[PDB]
Design an enzyme around this catalytic site. Structure first.
Site, PDB file in Angstrom:
ATOM      1  N   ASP A 110      36.521  38.443  32.944  1.00 20.36           N
ATOM      2  CA  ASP A 110      35.289  37.824  32.465  1.00 20.36           C
ATOM      3  C   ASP A 110      35.097  37.973  30.959  1.00 20.36           C
ATOM      4  O   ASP A 110      34.270  37.270  30.377  1.00 20.36           O
ATOM      5  CB  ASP A 110      34.083  38.359  33.262  1.00 20.36           C
ATOM      6  CG  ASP A 110      33.827  39.866  33.092  1.00 20.36           C
ATOM      7  OD1 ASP A 110      33.047  40.407  33.877  1.00 20.36           O
ATOM      8  OD2 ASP A 110      34.392  40.562  32.250  1.00 20.36           O
ATOM      9  N   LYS A 162      22.734  52.729  32.814  1.00 22.51           N
ATOM     10  CA  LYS A 162      22.539  51.310  32.536  1.00 22.51           C
ATOM     11  C   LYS A 162      21.218  51.027  31.805  1.00 22.51           C
ATOM     12  O   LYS A 162      21.289  50.441  30.721  1.00 22.51           O
ATOM     13  CB  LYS A 162      22.700  50.465  33.813  1.00 22.51           C
ATOM     14  N   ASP A 218      31.049  38.634  27.528  1.00 25.11           N
ATOM     15  CA  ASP A 218      31.571  38.497  28.878  1.00 25.11           C
ATOM     16  C   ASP A 218      30.829  37.357  29.555  1.00 25.11           C
ATOM     17  O   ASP A 218      29.617  37.228  29.404  1.00 25.11           O
ATOM     18  CB  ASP A 218      31.435  39.794  29.680  1.00 25.11           C
ATOM     19  CG  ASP A 218      29.994  40.199  29.908  1.00 25.11           C
ATOM     20  OD1 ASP A 218      29.671  40.653  31.005  1.00 25.11           O
ATOM     21  OD2 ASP A 218      29.169  40.074  29.001  1.00 25.11           O
TER      22      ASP A 218
HETATM   23  N1  LIG Z   1      41.252  41.902  43.070  1.00 26.37           N
HETATM   24  C1  LIG Z   1      40.003  42.343  42.966  1.00 26.37           C
HETATM   25  N2  LIG Z   1      39.391  42.193  41.806  1.00 26.37           N
HETATM   26  C2  LIG Z   1      38.133  42.638  41.711  1.00 26.37           C
HETATM   27  C3  LIG Z   1      37.508  43.235  42.805  1.00 26.37           C
HETATM   28  N3  LIG Z   1      36.257  43.585  42.436  1.00 26.37           N
HETATM   29  C4  LIG Z   1      36.090  43.235  41.154  1.00 26.37           C
HETATM   30  N4  LIG Z   1      37.227  42.640  40.695  1.00 26.37           N
HETATM   31  C5  LIG Z   1      37.380  42.142  39.327  1.00 26.37           C
HETATM   32  O1  LIG Z   1      36.789  43.052  38.425  1.00 26.37           O
HETATM   33  C6  LIG Z   1      36.521  42.331  37.206  1.00 26.37           C
HETATM   34  C7  LIG Z   1      35.166  42.765  36.676  1.00 26.37           C
HETATM   35  O2  LIG Z   1      34.292  42.922  37.782  1.00 26.37           O
HETATM   36  P1  LIG Z   1      32.830  42.273  37.691  1.00 26.37           P
HETATM   37  O3  LIG Z   1      32.398  42.225  36.280  1.00 26.37           O
HETATM   38  O4  LIG Z   1      31.843  43.178  38.581  1.00 26.37           O
HETATM   39  O5  LIG Z   1      32.867  40.786  38.289  1.00 26.37           O
HETATM   40  P2  LIG Z   1      32.785  40.318  39.823  1.00 26.37           P
HETATM   41  O6  LIG Z   1      33.698  41.291  40.687  1.00 26.37           O
HETATM   42  O7  LIG Z   1      33.291  38.934  39.848  1.00 26.37           O
HETATM   43  O8  LIG Z   1      31.295  40.435  40.393  1.00 26.37           O
HETATM   44  P3  LIG Z   1      29.906  39.825  39.901  1.00 26.37           P
HETATM   45  O9  LIG Z   1      29.823  39.958  38.433  1.00 26.37           O
HETATM   46  O10 LIG Z   1      28.700  40.616  40.616  1.00 26.37           O
HETATM   47  O11 LIG Z   1      29.880  38.343  40.278  1.00 26.37           O
HETATM   48  C8  LIG Z   1      36.444  40.837  37.568  1.00 26.37           C
HETATM   49  O12 LIG Z   1      37.488  40.105  36.922  1.00 26.37           O
HETATM   50  C9  LIG Z   1      36.640  40.829  39.096  1.00 26.37           C
HETATM   51  O13 LIG Z   1      37.428  39.705  39.482  1.00 26.37           O
HETATM   52  C10 LIG Z   1      38.221  43.360  44.010  1.00 26.37           C
HETATM   53  O14 LIG Z   1      37.691  43.881  44.971  1.00 26.37           O
HETATM   54  N5  LIG Z   1      39.493  42.910  44.098  1.00 26.37           N
END
Ligand SMILES: Nc1nc2c(ncn2[C@@H]2O[C@H](COP(=O)(O)OP(=O)(O)OP(=O)(O)O)[C@@H](O)[C@H]2O)c(=O)[nH]1
Ligand SMILES: Nc1nc2c(ncn2[C@@H]2O[C@H](COP(=O)(O)OP(=O)(O)OP(=O)(O)O)[C@@H](O)[C@H]2O)c(=O)[nH]1
Lengths: 360, 360
Positions: A110, A162, A218
């Site tokens: 992101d 946070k 981000d």
């Molecule tokens: N493969 C994989 N990637 C994950 C998982 N959980 C989080 N990520 C990755 O971790 C990175 C940062 O996590 P976040 O900023 O919380 O983003 P998100 O998991 O899409 O969740 P939200 O922001 O709540 O929509 C992102 O690129 C996600 O794709 C997972 O369980 N499996």
């Protein structure tokens, strides 16, 4: 070297876009944001990159198989059968990253930035401990990890909280370098890398901070998507003016694809990313927008600060504002006003929406 | 005959227009409200009419002494130095209406109809009583003076200005035929013709009602103004169809002055009247609007149910909806949204108006 990118997290913020196309495959200025990251560390010096996928694996596999021939470096894939959180990518591919006893990049898809692979690995060879973080100075962006750090020593002595951020005003930047000892210090249990186990590493004195040089965002949220788009366009202006399209009917910084055509009498305002094959009819003012691939905007329509998805058709005399996001293949009927509308994909809006409201 | 038009003064309902040009002189479908009355009086066979002015008699009287020689009837005037209301000029013009033993028309200055003067006076002499008024049916009779009309003759049994209990359904159409004997009854002290004159008339059985044919509206408010121009363009569609300009890109009933022009790729939607000397640019969509004299509407605008007064400059990409009235010489900047904006004369708008407000 090597690089891990966490690319399977469901993208629940940025939802009308990520309900169709996964979060790093979402087109960000005529390119997926993952392609920005893997091109930056293709040209940087990691020659083999792992990306760990838990959500819509098949089309990520499509463009990754089409993409690792296109870069020249290896695109290895850590596949899973259950989402393993933010840290489980390190534990499932623990067998592949532990083969060398060298640190590695842990990237987040992101993030948009100007990437310091250079200063990252030289700073990491300087500080001599285990963990190294990028950190960006902010004003309101607190949702991230509060870090209390001193000067150049940059040894992190206090960490994440946070809200109500009176101590720091600089937060995490989602791009780390970690040595193999933490890579097999932690379980394959589903857990977060920055809440549970990064706090232990800040308690242990392993964690260092490198302040980023500028231009960080981000794009987890669509408001942050648009602000990162404007920031990426003014940082693209300084480096190479040769890519930004010019014209009498355009204003400021615009990124139109060569497939995309603009009709006459248009005032394409500042900070506009027009995707592949998009069709703009005659007399369309578009400011602070990002029209993604193959979406049509008809004539006499006004658009400000709003994301148009893939193959959406926007009618005549439409006014869109207040970060309205359309999902995939949405039809906006003629002479309507959308202020705040998040429209889930395959909808046909028939009345004007004057206040922020999710239309599914 | 004689004809007495009590022409109002200060025009508080329908205020942004009357702050520059009085309510008998604001053009309703490309000629003023008094002019419809006095051309129908000149067709009726009235020999000279008198209008009971109290406010802004400079521009009004200069117009009346202009068209006195054009209608060919002596447009005589009752000046007042203070307002006498609705039964005061009945007693000021006591001599100037008591000269002949012949009935006289008493007309509201704001009612626009398909008048039946012949029907009204030659219904009047069939009963020969002191007063014979015009009545019309309406859906909300609590705003207008109701009557109780009996069968086949039409004696006013009761008369109340606001019923509040729902006595009946028919209302005052705003046109009366009065006999000269009711002149000397009331005094010069200002009061209401409806509260006291007609309510003592109905006690005798000297008030009468004539049922109208249809198309009655009093244009006091801008909402009533736009509903009335809808009904007037309907009457033109029924009776004189060539007066309406219909062409290729014309939708519905449009009444255009010859001096007004309209660009290409525009859609001049149903029930629109364009006043004299306006200039309409290319790419607009104007539905249910009146555009008064010499006003300008620049390109790619969307105007619906709105009044654009004299010498206004509505900019580009401008949305206006919800009975937004502009006063004389108002400049709207580019890409602004006005929902409900009553805008005071000689104002320049630089911000969007998302809710109905008065702008001063
Ligand atoms: N493969 C994989 N990637 C994950 C998982 N959980 C989080 N990520 C990755 O971790 C990175 C940062 O996590 P976040 O900023 O919380 O983003 P998100 O998991 O899409 O969740 P939200 O922001 O709540 O929509 C992102 O690129 C996600 O794709 C997972 O369980 N499996
Ligand atoms: N000559 C004259 N006529 C008046 C005067 N006051 C009211 N009238 C008339 O009285 C009748 C009823 O008045 P309204 O329907 O309220 O219209 P208005 O006088 O313009 O006043 P508002 O619309 O309420 O601001 C209308 O025909 C007016 O023309 C006056 O002071 N002088």
């Amino acid at each position: 070297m090597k690089a891990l990118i966490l690319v399977g997290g469901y993208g629940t913020r940025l939802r009308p876009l990520t309900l169709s196309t996964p979060k790093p495959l979402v087109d960000f200025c005529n390119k997926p944001i993952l392609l920005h990251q893997v091109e930056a560390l293709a040209a940087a010096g990691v020659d083999h990159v792992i990306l760990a996928v838990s959500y819509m694996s098949q089309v990520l596999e499509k463009e990754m198989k089409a993409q690792e021939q296109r870069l020249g470096i290896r695109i290895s894939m850590s596949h899973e059968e259950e989402p393993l959180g933010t840290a489980g990518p390190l534990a499932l591919a623990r067998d592949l990253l532990s083969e060398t006893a060298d640190p590695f990049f842990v990237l987040n898809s992101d993030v948009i930035c100007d990437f310091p692979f250079q200063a990252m690995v030289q700073f990491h060879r300087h500080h001599g401990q285990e963990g190294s973080i990028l950190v960006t100075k902010v004003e309101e962006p607190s949702k991230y990890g509060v870090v209390v750090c001193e000067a150049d020593t940059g040894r992190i002595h206090r960490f994440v909280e946070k809200p109500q951020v009176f101590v720091s005003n600089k937060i995490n930047a989602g791009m780390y370098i970690l040595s193999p000892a933490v890579l097999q210090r932690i379980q394959l249990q589903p857990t977060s890398i920055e809440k549970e186990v990064f706090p232990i590493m800040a308690k242990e004195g392993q964690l260092y901070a490198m302040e980023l040089q500028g231009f960080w965002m981000d794009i987890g949220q669509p408001k942050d998507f648009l602000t990162g788009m404007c920031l990426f366009l003014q940082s693209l202006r300084q480096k190479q003016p040769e890519r930004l399209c010019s014209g009498p009917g355009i204003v400021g910084n615009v990124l139109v694809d060569p497939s995309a055509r603009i009709g006459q009498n248009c005032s394409i305002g500042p900070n506009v990313s027009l995707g592949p094959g998009v069709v703009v009819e005659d007399g369309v003012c578009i400011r602070r927008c990002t029209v993604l691939r193959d979406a049509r905007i008809r004539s006499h329509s006004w658009l400000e600060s709003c994301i148009v998805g893939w193959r959406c058709r926007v009618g005549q005399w439409v006014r869109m504002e207040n970060v309205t996001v359309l999902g995939e293949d949405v039809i906006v009927n003629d002479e309507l006003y959308l202020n705040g509308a998040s429209v889930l994909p395959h909808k046909s809006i028939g009345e004007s929406v004057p206040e922020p409201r999710i239309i599914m």
